[PDB]
Amino acid sequence: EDTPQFKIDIDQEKAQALGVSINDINTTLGAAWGGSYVNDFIDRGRVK
């Protein structure tokens, strides 16, 4: 069933006025709250 969700609206005008890019806003929001797969590293010989 449908559940409550948190709708957040970015104000484009204010962002442009402050000189804040939409990509930075969305990366910051998504990376922090959702997580982001950056790239791989090698842990004791296995790529992870």
Partner: protein, 48 residues
């Protein structure tokens, strides 16, 4: 919707006025391409 595309904010001018997408373009639902136009016995048609 066309309305939503129309209010995409392209920029804010120095005097604080807003340049929206609809101020530099016409916005409509139209074909991906306009090359192929069919008729059935003289009347407008589509087909597969």
């Amino acid at each position: 919707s066309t309305e939503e595309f129309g209010k995409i904010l392209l920029k804010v001018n120095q005097d604080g006025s807003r340049v929206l997408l609809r101020d530099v373009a016409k916005i409509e639902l139209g074909g991906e391409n306009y090359d192929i136009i069919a008729e059935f016995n003289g009347q407008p048609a589509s087909g597969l």
